[PDB]
Structures are given as C-alpha cells and as structure tokens.
Design a protein around this ligand. Structure first.
Ligand SMILES: NS(=O)(=O)/N=C1/NCCS1
Ligand SMILES: [Zn+2]
Length: 257
C-alpha cells in the first residue's frame, strides 16, 4: 500500500507514513498576490543551464524525471533568495486530467494545467542526499504551464514518453536543453517550503515564476497517456499527480518584482 494520488493512498493519507505532511513549512501553497511583498534584498536570479547534461528519463510511478549529470558544476541556479550555488539534478512535472487543474502551487486560487519543477541541491552539502537533511538544502524552480500554443522545446520530451509508458521504465535521454522550457521573464515569488511528494522534507527554497509557459493541447494529452501502473498491470492513467495547497502557517511569500 504505498503512497500515490488515489482515494485510498492520496495526499489526505500521506501523513500516516509521513507525519511531516502536517508540518510547519509544507508545499505547495496558494500564492496570494496581494499579500506577497516585494523584497528589495533579493539579488538578481541567475539560471545558468548552458552546459546542462541530461542523461535519462524515467517513469517512477508518480511522474517522469529527466535526470542530469550533476557530478560537476554545470547547470546551476544562483542569486535571488539563494546563498551560494545550487546544482540541477532533475526536472519533472505535475499535471491534471483536464486543462483546468494540475498545478500544485496556485495563484490567487487559480490552478494551471501543469507545473514544471526543476530540482537543485545546494553544493555546500556535497550531494543531494546530504542536502535533504538541511533546511536550505534544495531550491526548486517552479514554472506554470497553460494550454495554448505549443512549446517547441518541450517536444523532445513529449516524443519519448511512448517508451516509458509504465512504472519503472527508463530511456536514454541525452542533450536535452532545459533552457527551452523557460518563459521570457524571470519574475518570481519565493518562500520556504518542502518537497511536495513523500517524504515531504522541509528543505526547499521555492522559486515560482510568475510567467507561465504555453504548451499545446496535444503536448499535455501525451502526458496524460502515461501510466501509474507497471507493465502488464491494469491501466491507471498518470493524471492528477498534484498535491493541493497546504496551510501557509508562519510564512511570508516575497516577490522579486
Ligand atoms: N515535487 S517536488 O519536486 O517537491 N518533490 C520532490 N521529491 C523528490 C525530490 S523532488
Ligand atoms: Zn514536483
């Protein structure tokens, strides 16, 4: 009976195996744009993905991860609220069964069709596993997806999904450029939070871009053809793999703009 997104194992049940689900800095959250305050102490955000080196794509039964070679300082996030350098290790998405839902964060209660998470770890801790024992161990760059025009930079991901339909399948996925997934503007909101999947660790500085990217209906429809189940098992489409907004508690959301 492991965790998932269904009636009997979904987000309302995670707290039994992962009590931090009811913690003081859980994610995602609703971003109330009128209560968010501009912070002139934030330095410019630096997304440096030119030497990023993707290696593989994997269906983990919860989403798909595009994994990077993080053995050297290549694809990094710096600046903004961050102290020091954070290295990209993977990205993945959360999405819905319908275009009117799928994002994890919300903006004045608005749900987007999907949300992209670029996961980075603080290099002062040496690797990802040590970083997730630290309150400033991770930085996740969150980007909203709306349905409209296609995102050309996403198509290479879309086109490999047929080869990883089911849980545990993976494929070679070299030379993917994550710069092709970024909107024009780097205007963001930031707050301290957590991973949004078990184990829900409270190690994340969230950086959520204000400008969504547009993807086409055909692109998101291909996400929704993935499966939560493994091969040869009854089909459960991989849809609505998002955690709803959690209590803000004693936090302030800051704006960079
Ligand atoms: N959705 S998320 O990016 O906050 N969750 C994660 N769990 C494992 C590392 S990334
Ligand atoms: Zn995520």
């Amino acid at each position: 009976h492991h965790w998932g997104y269904g009636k009997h194992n979904g987000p309302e049940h995670w707290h039994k195996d992962f009590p931090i689900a009811k913690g003081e800095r859980q994610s995602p959250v609703d971003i109330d744009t009128h209560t968010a305050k501009y912070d002139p102490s934030l330095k410019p955000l630096s997304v440096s993905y030119d030497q990023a080196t993707s290696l593989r794509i994997l269906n983990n039964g919860h989403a798909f991860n595009v994994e990077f070679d993080d053995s050297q300082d290549k694809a990094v996030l710096k600046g903004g609220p961050l102290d020091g350098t954070y290295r990209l290790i993977q990205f993945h998405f959360h999405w819905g069964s319908l275009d009117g839902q799928g994002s994890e964060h919300t903006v004045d209660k608005k749900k987007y069709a999907a949300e992209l998470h670029l996961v980075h770890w603080n290099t002062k801790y040496g690797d990802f596993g040590k970083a997730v024992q630290q309150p400033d161990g991770l930085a996740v760059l969150g980007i909203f997806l709306k349905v409209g025009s296609a995102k050309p930079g996403l198509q290479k991901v879309v086109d490999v999904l047929d080869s990883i339909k089911t849980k545990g399948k993976s494929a070679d996925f070299t030379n993917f450029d994550p710069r092709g997934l970024l909107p024009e503007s780097l205007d963001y909101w930031t707050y301290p939070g957590s991973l949004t999947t078990p184990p829900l660790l409270e190690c994340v500085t969230w950086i959520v871009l204000k400008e969504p990217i547009s993807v086409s209906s055909e692109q998101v429809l291909k996400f929704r053809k993935l499966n939560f189940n493994g091969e040869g098992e009854p089909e459960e489409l991989m849809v609505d793999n998002w955690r709803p907004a959690q209590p803000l508690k004693n936090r302030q959301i800051k704006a960079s703009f």
